[PDB]
Design a protein around this ligand. Structure first.
Ligand code: ZN
Length: 101
């Protein structure tokens, strides 16, 4: 496929009978500051903790100072999973019914 990992994730997962998934974007600031001279560190060295959630689990993780790089990492995570067919993102679940081995 090409490009947008989110669409790929949706394309198959929603078709597997899943709707419970999505990306989370929380900032993980690296506090190298012991004390400071203002209320809070106006702007310290923070990192965008991009991650992909699937049933409360972490399928993709990519923390970077650059939003693009952060996204890039997590994207290539699930990207490899749908390419390699690793069940970490693509496993069957009960958003519809039971499963069969
Ligand atoms: Zn599900």
């Amino acid at each position: 496929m090409k490009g947008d990992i989110e669409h790929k994730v949706y394309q198959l997962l929603k078709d597997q009978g899943c709707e419970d998934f999505g990306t989370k974007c929380v900032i993980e600031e690296v506090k190298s500051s012991h004390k400071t001279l203002l209320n809070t560190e106006l702007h310290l060295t923070k990192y965008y903790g991009f991650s992909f959630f699937r049933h409360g689990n972490i399928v993709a993780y990519g923390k970077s100072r650059k939003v693009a790089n952060a996204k890039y990492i997590m994207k290539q995570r699930l990207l490899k999973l749908l390419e390699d067919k690793s069940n970490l993102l693509l496993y069957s679940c009960n958003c519809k019914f039971s499963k069969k081995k």
